[PDB]
């Protein structure tokens, strides 16, 4: 899950405050690439 990736501990500061991956990045499920986008009669579509 995106949650689990968010919890990833990058480092801990001197005071002891945790720096998680979600503190330095936005974490979501998204395509390996965003180059190819398809439509079927002006309607959102994929295909093979």
């Amino acid at each position: 899950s995106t949650e689990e990736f968010g919890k990833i501990l990058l480092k801990v500061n001197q005071d002891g405050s945790r720096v998680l991956l979600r503190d330095v990045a936005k974490i979501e499920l998204g395509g390996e690439n965003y180059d190819i986008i398809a439509e079927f009669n002006g309607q959102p579509a994929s295909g093979l």
Partner: protein, 155 residues
């Protein structure tokens, strides 16, 4: 025992009719596999509510601990079995039970974010300030997991 191993299998599989017949013939309810899991441990784990009640009616140890100190309430709370958690607590389950790690049913419930079970545990007097071997509370888990709903409940 013979029936002890059959009850362990029956309780796990969730065959209510077989468990009934075993309780009549007198299958050992305190039977334990190599890891120290009783039929109640298994019933609680696999979410078999009817068998949990049947086992407890037949003098099953509610505060039985495995070889690492985990109880049926730890399992029921961790895997989100609200109905079984209530039954266990009604029959006198140690709400502040600590395993060998110092983890409680509240810690485990908070970790998977079972909001209903967390409020049930707190109702039956769960120690909200209870710390595991790393000094982490159910609240420390909630803010790390990023569970805003769970965070509000523990205040």
């Amino acid at each position: 025992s013979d029936l002890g191993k059959k009850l362990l299998e029956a309780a796990r599989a969730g065959r209510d009719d077989e468990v009934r017949i075993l309780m009549a013939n007198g299958a050992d309810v305190n039977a334990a596999d190599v890891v120290g899991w009783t039929p109640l441990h298994l019933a609680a784990y696999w979410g078999h509510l009817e068998i949990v009640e049947v086992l407890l009616k037949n003098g099953a140890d509610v505060n039985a601990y495995d070889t690492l100190g985990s109880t049926p309430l730890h399992l029921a709370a961790h895997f989100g079995h609200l109905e079984i958690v209530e039954v266990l607590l009604k029959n006198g389950a140690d709400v502040n039970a600590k395993d060998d790690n110092g983890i409680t049913p509240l810690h485990l419930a908070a970790n998977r974010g079972h909001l209903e079970i967390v409020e049930v545990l707190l109702k039956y007097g769960a120690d909200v300030n209870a710390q595991d071997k790393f000094g982490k509370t159910a609240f420390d888990i909630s803010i790390n997991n990023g569970n805003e709903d769970l965070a509000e409940i523990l205040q």
